[model samples]
Target: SERVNYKPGMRVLTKMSGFPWWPSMVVTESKMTSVARKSKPKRAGTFYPVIFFPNKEYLWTGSDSLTPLTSEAISQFLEKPKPKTASLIKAYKMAQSTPDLDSLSVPS
Candidate 1:
């Protein structure tokens, strides 16, 4: 599948399980390609693991299980009335102030 347009450090909430789970995390990295196998050999194909860093790995299951939040949903979630600009600016400032670390620091 084509990589979804996501940037490293962009905050995003991800569903914690299969299709029906509730969302969690705030994205900490861009999508990454990884090996995957099909339930049946004939259906096998390469896929990208849309990685995210959970605010707390309280729900982690050590498995490839998560779904990215849709753009529409994200926009709506950020649209709630408040100091939206200030909130976004704060995040940007934080990112800017933080020094770039090694790739190993990025969550898998």
Candidate 2:
């Protein structure tokens, strides 16, 4: 199979196990260096590290569960936010507006 060309800092949608699709940002080992411990290569298939939105939770998942962030996906969620996903909606908006997602600070 082919590997996904995911780089650290790209926005993506994740769906694994029993979890529904969620918005997240790609993270790297170096970026998480400040933390005492970082994500380990748990699953198979070119695993990637990500930080989910709102809660800012980190996880490691295979490429099969990740889909590149898209304009259409953003628009779909933009119309679907019902308070709980307000941060998600905001993240999509932010993803569309910003050129790069590698930075620690959000663009004002």
Candidate 3:
């Protein structure tokens, strides 16, 4: 099976804290692995622990449960992608959830 590179700011799908799985995964949350994945057209359960922000999302899979979204789906679901910027991330205070996010946080 194909696998995600697992970058912090990439994009991904995550399990909701309370819900078993989202209705259509269209209700994407900000990457926490992050996005709740756009929820725009997502199903219940898969891979991705990313760091994309906006009205967009992420994905993946494994020896876990229901299969994951193919790369094709990820590219399609993204509605309005947030540009990876400095001030934006700091403002959300949504950092620290994904480990490598900080790597991109600092400017070179």
Candidate 4:
């Protein structure tokens, strides 16, 4: 069998048992970081560390449940993501638009 060409800092389409594939990165020492630690996989496997933010593993079962991070995967991470949508920066920009958004009273 061929080993997947993965390394730290590179994003990957990672999968958690009983869940789906999401964008993640193999941080140092096998820490597979993500937008959120949805929940630990059903069955115990490797421990890949993960994290979350604006939202949202352990040895992270990488090198096992593997899929290559091709340019065709995404932009910013994939082959090409619409500048805002892909980065989720669209969400960020919308929130940041109004400095006083929190102060704005809701229409009754």
lDDT of each: 0.32, 0.64, 0.32, 0.39
Query: lDDT by residue for model 3 over 1-108, one digit each (tens)?
Result: 454343334323433444222111111134333233343335575444333332223333321422233334334433322344443333223322322333333222
In angstroms, the error of model 1 at 39 is 14
Best TM-score among the predictions, by candidate number: 2
What lDDT does candidate 1 reach at residue 69?
46
Return whichever of 1 and 4 wins on lDDT.
4
Among these predicted structures, which one has the highest lDDT?
2
Residue-by-residue lDDT tens digits, candidate 4, 43-94: 6565443221112122345456555444344334333333435334322232
Point out the higher-scoring one by TM-score: 2 or 4. 2
Q: Report model 2's TM-score to 2 decimal places.
A: 0.65
TM-score, cand. 3 vs. native: 0.23
lDDT by residue for model 1 (4-108), tens: 443333333334333223333322223221221121123345322322222122222112334444445444444441234553333233323332222213335
Superposed by TM-score, candidate 4 places the C-alpha of residue 62 at a distance from the truth, in angstroms, of: 2.9
**Candidate 3, which segments miss by more than 4 Å at Cα?**
1-5, 19-52, 55-71, 75-108
Is 1 or 4 the stronger prediction by TM-score? 4
Provide C-alpha RMSD values for all models, in order.
10.2, 4.3, 12.1, 11.3
Better of 3 and 4 by TM-score: 4
Worst 10 residues of 2 by lDDT: 29-38
